[PDB]
């Protein structure tokens, strides 16, 4: 609540710059690793048949997408979906049990 800190808003500005820099760093590293992965694939591809090419490139793609979805929160959106669905069935269970608790007062 100070004058030097602008009531906490200056250190908050620096925190946010830090958080944005760190996400930019993570996405940059992902970008470079994804492109270097494709070169590794191109280097190996010569000695591999189509099924072996697809197995190797699939694991490299699987790796990139898993990291991307951790950075952009798509991993968490997929979880949110499963949990929201589970919640709308549990709500249907409580409605019944509340009725049976109501009627069981008789």
């Amino acid at each position: 609540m100070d004058a030097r800190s602008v009531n906490g808003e200056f250190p908050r500005h620096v925190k946010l710059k830090n958080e944005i820099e760190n996400l930019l760093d993570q996405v940059t590293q992902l970008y470079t690793k994804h492109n270097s992965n494709y070169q590794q694939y191109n280097a190996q591809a010569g000695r591999l048949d189509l099924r072996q090419k697809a197995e190797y490139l699939k694991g490299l793609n699987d790796w990139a997408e898993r990291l991307l979805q951790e950075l952009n929160g798509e991993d968490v959106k997929k979880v949110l979906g499963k949990v929201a669905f589970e919640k709308d069935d549990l709500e249907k269970e409580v409605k019944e049990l509340k009725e049976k608790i109501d009627k069981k007062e008789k």
Binding site: N18, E21, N22, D25, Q26, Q29, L30, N37, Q40, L67
Partner: peptide, 24 residues
């Protein structure tokens, strides 16, 4: 003076070792 936030995540690791040799 509380502690500062944790530093940023590390860089991803290097690619894994080659798989085992194929069959004869």
């Amino acid at each position: 003076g509380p502690p500062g936030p944790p530093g940023p995540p590390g860089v991803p690791g290097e690619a894994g070792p080659p798989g085992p040799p194929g069959p004869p």
